[PDB]
Amino acid sequence: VAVQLFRPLQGLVLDTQLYGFPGAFDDWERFMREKLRVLKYEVLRIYPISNYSN
Amino acid sequence: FMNIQLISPIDAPILRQWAEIIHRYWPNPSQIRYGAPNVFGSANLFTPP
């Protein structure tokens, strides 16, 4: 019925409507996975892992 | 505009469709031949005569 958020995902401060999440847990998990993949590639574009590894 | 994956297909369906239309159907440039360099020469600068 609910989920606890660790870090990251500790910066959700706006209304739930703006995020527009799916209702069911499995759908929400999927939705979050595809949305986080794009952000990962976006940050890796700026910071290559071979230079900023540590 | 460059990474169309950043536009949500659910929250922004119409705007995503309009972006991929531009990428796939904008006109493609081409070229043509003109002139007679034997007599008139060529005045082209940044392109082949």
Coordinates of N, CA and C in Angstrom, one line a residue:
Chain A
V1 N 0.8 -1.2 0.0 CA 0.0 0.0 0.0 C 0.8 1.3 0.0
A2 N 2.1 1.2 0.4 CA 3.0 2.4 0.4 C 4.4 1.9 0.2
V3 N 5.3 2.9 -0.1 CA 6.7 2.6 -0.3 C 7.5 3.7 0.4
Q4 N 8.7 3.3 0.9 CA 9.6 4.1 1.6 C 10.7 4.5 0.7
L5 N 11.1 5.8 0.7 CA 12.1 6.3 -0.3 C 13.4 6.6 0.4
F6 N 14.5 5.9 -0.1 CA 15.8 6.2 0.3 C 16.5 7.3 -0.5
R7 N 17.8 7.4 -0.5 CA 18.5 8.3 -1.4 C 19.1 7.6 -2.6
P8 N 19.0 8.1 -3.8 CA 18.2 9.4 -4.1 C 16.7 9.1 -4.1
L9 N 16.0 10.0 -4.7 CA 14.5 10.1 -4.6 C 14.0 10.7 -3.3
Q10 N 14.9 11.5 -2.6 CA 14.5 12.2 -1.4 C 14.2 13.7 -1.7
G11 N 14.0 14.1 -2.9 CA 13.8 15.4 -3.3 C 12.4 15.7 -3.9
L12 N 11.5 14.8 -3.6 CA 10.1 15.0 -4.1 C 9.4 16.0 -3.2
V13 N 9.3 17.2 -3.6 CA 8.7 18.3 -2.7 C 7.4 18.9 -3.4
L14 N 7.1 18.6 -4.6 CA 6.0 19.2 -5.3 C 4.7 18.4 -5.1
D15 N 3.7 18.8 -5.8 CA 2.4 18.0 -5.8 C 2.5 16.7 -6.5
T16 N 1.8 15.7 -6.1 CA 1.8 14.4 -6.7 C 1.3 14.4 -8.1
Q17 N 0.4 15.3 -8.4 CA -0.2 15.4 -9.8 C 0.9 15.8 -10.8
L18 N 1.8 16.6 -10.4 CA 2.9 17.0 -11.3 C 3.8 15.8 -11.7
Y19 N 4.1 15.0 -10.7 CA 4.8 13.8 -11.0 C 4.0 12.8 -11.9
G20 N 2.7 12.7 -11.5 CA 1.8 11.8 -12.3 C 2.3 10.4 -12.4
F21 N 2.3 9.7 -11.2 CA 2.8 8.3 -11.1 C 1.7 7.3 -11.4
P22 N 2.0 6.2 -11.9 CA 1.0 5.1 -12.0 C 0.6 4.6 -10.6
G23 N -0.6 4.0 -10.5 CA -1.1 3.6 -9.2 C -0.6 2.4 -8.6
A24 N -0.5 1.3 -9.4 CA -0.1 0.0 -8.9 C 1.4 -0.1 -8.7
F25 N 1.8 -0.9 -7.7 CA 3.2 -1.0 -7.4 C 4.1 -1.4 -8.5
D26 N 3.7 -2.5 -9.2 CA 4.6 -3.0 -10.3 C 4.7 -2.0 -11.4
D27 N 3.6 -1.3 -11.8 CA 3.6 -0.3 -12.8 C 4.5 0.9 -12.4
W28 N 4.4 1.2 -11.1 CA 5.2 2.3 -10.6 C 6.7 2.0 -10.6
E29 N 7.0 0.7 -10.3 CA 8.4 0.3 -10.3 C 9.0 0.4 -11.8
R30 N 8.2 -0.1 -12.7 CA 8.6 -0.1 -14.1 C 8.8 1.4 -14.5
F31 N 7.8 2.2 -14.3 CA 7.8 3.6 -14.7 C 9.1 4.3 -14.2
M32 N 9.4 4.0 -12.9 CA 10.6 4.6 -12.3 C 11.9 4.1 -13.0
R33 N 11.9 2.8 -13.3 CA 13.1 2.3 -14.0 C 13.4 2.9 -15.3
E34 N 12.4 3.0 -16.2 CA 12.6 3.7 -17.5 C 12.9 5.1 -17.3
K35 N 12.3 5.8 -16.4 CA 12.6 7.2 -16.2 C 14.0 7.5 -15.7
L36 N 14.5 6.6 -14.8 CA 15.8 6.8 -14.2 C 16.9 6.4 -15.2
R37 N 16.6 5.5 -16.1 CA 17.6 5.2 -17.1 C 18.1 6.4 -17.9
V38 N 17.1 7.2 -18.4 CA 17.4 8.4 -19.2 C 18.3 9.4 -18.4
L39 N 17.9 9.6 -17.2 CA 18.7 10.5 -16.3 C 20.1 10.0 -16.1
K40 N 20.3 8.7 -16.0 CA 21.6 8.1 -15.9 C 22.4 8.4 -17.1
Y41 N 21.9 8.2 -18.3 CA 22.6 8.5 -19.5 C 22.9 10.0 -19.7
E42 N 22.0 10.8 -19.2 CA 22.2 12.2 -19.3 C 23.4 12.7 -18.4
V43 N 23.5 12.1 -17.2 CA 24.6 12.5 -16.4 C 25.9 11.9 -16.9
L44 N 25.8 10.7 -17.4 CA 27.0 10.1 -18.0 C 27.5 10.8 -19.2
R45 N 26.6 11.5 -19.9 CA 27.1 12.3 -21.1 C 28.1 13.4 -20.6
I46 N 27.8 14.0 -19.5 CA 28.6 15.1 -19.0 C 29.8 14.6 -18.3
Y47 N 29.7 13.6 -17.4 CA 30.8 13.0 -16.6 C 31.0 11.6 -17.1
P48 N 32.0 11.4 -17.9 CA 32.4 10.0 -18.3 C 32.9 9.2 -17.1
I49 N 32.6 7.9 -17.0 CA 33.0 7.1 -15.9 C 34.5 6.9 -15.9
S50 N 35.2 7.0 -17.0 CA 36.6 6.7 -17.1 C 37.4 7.8 -16.4
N51 N 36.9 9.0 -16.3 CA 37.6 10.1 -15.7 C 37.1 10.5 -14.3
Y52 N 35.8 10.3 -14.0 CA 35.3 10.7 -12.7 C 34.8 9.5 -11.9
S53 N 35.6 8.4 -12.0 CA 35.1 7.2 -11.4 C 35.0 7.3 -9.9
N54 N 35.9 7.9 -9.2 CA 35.9 8.0 -7.7 C 35.8 9.4 -7.2
Chain B
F1 N 14.9 19.0 -27.5 CA 14.8 18.9 -28.9 C 15.8 17.9 -29.5
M2 N 17.0 17.8 -29.0 CA 18.0 16.9 -29.5 C 17.8 15.5 -29.1
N3 N 17.5 15.3 -27.8 CA 17.3 14.0 -27.2 C 15.8 13.9 -26.9
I4 N 15.1 13.3 -27.9 CA 13.6 13.3 -27.8 C 13.2 12.3 -26.7
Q5 N 14.1 11.5 -26.2 CA 13.7 10.6 -25.1 C 13.3 11.4 -23.8
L6 N 13.7 12.7 -23.7 CA 13.4 13.5 -22.6 C 12.0 14.0 -22.5
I7 N 11.2 13.8 -23.6 CA 9.8 14.2 -23.7 C 9.0 12.9 -23.3
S8 N 8.1 13.1 -22.3 CA 7.4 11.9 -21.8 C 6.3 11.6 -22.8
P9 N 6.2 10.3 -23.3 CA 5.2 9.9 -24.2 C 3.8 9.9 -23.5
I10 N 3.7 9.9 -22.2 CA 2.5 9.9 -21.5 C 2.0 11.3 -21.1
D11 N 2.9 12.0 -20.5 CA 2.5 13.4 -20.1 C 2.5 14.3 -21.3
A12 N 3.3 14.1 -22.3 CA 3.4 15.0 -23.4 C 3.4 14.2 -24.7
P13 N 2.2 13.6 -25.1 CA 2.1 12.8 -26.3 C 2.2 13.6 -27.6
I14 N 1.5 14.7 -27.6 CA 1.5 15.5 -28.9 C 2.8 16.1 -29.2
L15 N 3.5 16.7 -28.2 CA 4.8 17.3 -28.4 C 5.8 16.3 -28.8
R16 N 5.8 15.1 -28.2 CA 6.7 14.1 -28.7 C 6.5 13.7 -30.1
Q17 N 5.3 13.6 -30.6 CA 5.0 13.3 -32.0 C 5.5 14.4 -32.9
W18 N 5.3 15.6 -32.5 CA 5.7 16.8 -33.3 C 7.2 16.8 -33.5
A19 N 8.0 16.4 -32.4 CA 9.4 16.4 -32.5 C 10.0 15.4 -33.5
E20 N 9.4 14.2 -33.4 CA 10.0 13.1 -34.3 C 9.5 13.3 -35.7
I21 N 8.5 14.1 -36.0 CA 8.1 14.4 -37.3 C 9.1 15.3 -38.0
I22 N 9.6 16.3 -37.2 CA 10.6 17.2 -37.7 C 11.9 16.5 -38.1
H23 N 12.3 15.6 -37.2 CA 13.6 14.9 -37.4 C 13.5 14.0 -38.7
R24 N 12.4 13.5 -39.0 CA 12.3 12.5 -40.1 C 11.8 13.0 -41.4
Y25 N 11.2 14.2 -41.5 CA 10.7 14.7 -42.7 C 11.1 16.1 -43.1
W26 N 12.0 16.7 -42.4 CA 12.6 18.0 -42.8 C 13.3 17.8 -44.1
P27 N 13.2 18.8 -45.0 CA 13.8 18.6 -46.4 C 15.3 18.4 -46.3
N28 N 15.8 17.6 -47.3 CA 17.2 17.3 -47.4 C 17.9 18.2 -48.4
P29 N 19.0 18.9 -48.1 CA 19.7 19.7 -49.1 C 20.3 18.9 -50.2
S30 N 20.5 19.6 -51.4 CA 21.0 18.9 -52.5 C 21.9 20.0 -53.3
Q31 N 22.2 19.6 -54.5 CA 23.1 20.4 -55.3 C 22.8 20.3 -56.8
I32 N 23.3 21.3 -57.6 CA 23.1 21.3 -59.0 C 24.3 22.0 -59.7
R33 N 24.5 21.8 -61.0 CA 25.6 22.3 -61.7 C 25.2 23.5 -62.6
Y34 N 26.1 24.5 -62.8 CA 25.8 25.6 -63.6 C 27.0 26.3 -64.1
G35 N 26.9 27.1 -65.1 CA 28.0 27.9 -65.6 C 28.9 27.2 -66.6
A36 N 29.9 27.9 -67.1 CA 30.9 27.4 -68.1 C 32.2 28.0 -67.7
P37 N 33.0 27.3 -66.8 CA 34.2 27.9 -66.3 C 35.3 28.1 -67.4
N38 N 35.2 27.5 -68.6 CA 36.2 27.6 -69.6 C 36.4 29.1 -70.0
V39 N 35.3 29.8 -70.2 CA 35.4 31.2 -70.7 C 35.1 32.2 -69.5
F40 N 34.1 31.9 -68.7 CA 33.7 32.9 -67.7 C 34.5 32.7 -66.4
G41 N 35.3 31.6 -66.3 CA 36.0 31.4 -65.0 C 35.0 31.0 -63.9
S42 N 35.5 31.0 -62.7 CA 34.7 30.6 -61.5 C 35.0 31.6 -60.4
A43 N 33.9 32.1 -59.8 CA 34.0 33.0 -58.7 C 33.6 32.4 -57.3
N44 N 33.4 31.1 -57.3 CA 33.1 30.4 -56.1 C 34.3 30.5 -55.1
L45 N 33.9 30.6 -53.8 CA 34.9 30.8 -52.7 C 35.0 29.6 -51.8
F46 N 33.9 29.2 -51.1 CA 33.8 28.2 -50.2 C 33.2 26.9 -50.7
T47 N 32.9 26.8 -52.0 CA 32.4 25.7 -52.6 C 33.1 25.3 -53.9
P48 N 33.1 24.1 -54.3 CA 33.8 23.7 -55.6 C 33.2 24.5 -56.7
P49 N 34.0 24.8 -57.8 CA 33.5 25.5 -58.9 C 32.4 24.7 -59.6

